């Protein structure tokens, strides 16, 4: 049970732009570790329908970003509604986590979740309101091990979702084994 409910629900997005009141979700993937960020199951990495009027209004870091890692052509000609993408996430939490036990993990995963509270909120029902955020840690590692800091991992930071869940799984590894107390 204890185990079950410690649990984290690995996620990151793509997202149009970052203005609630209009960008949509492109891209999403999800992982679910352990307590001890081993991999137990690989869910939906699912790319999602949107307009072609958004995608021509999109900011020009993000035309130029989407663009070349090939995300826009692929939202252009995907067939997944936001609806259908939600209820894979959903299903996917429901056979891995116990209900409202498990955080949403990542890099500054507030803003995936700002997203997925507005546009996937049964997705977010099955999880915990708290948040597990790299960058918290990132940031008090900077701070408080300047040291350490300078041996964390590089990122490649290709803006696709699955790629980046891995990236954020490992820095906070990176972090456990380097600046919390040895056992
Ligand atoms: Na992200």
Known sequence: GESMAQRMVWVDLEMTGLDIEKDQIIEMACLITDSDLNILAEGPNLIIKQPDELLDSMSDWCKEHHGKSGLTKAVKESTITLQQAEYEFLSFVRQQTPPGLCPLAGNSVHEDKKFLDKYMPQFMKHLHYRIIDVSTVKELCRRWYPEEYEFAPKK???????????????????????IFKKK
């Open 156 to 178: 490649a930071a290709s803006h696709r979702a699955l790629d980046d869940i891995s990236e954020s799984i490992k820095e906070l590894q990176f972090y456990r084994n380097n």
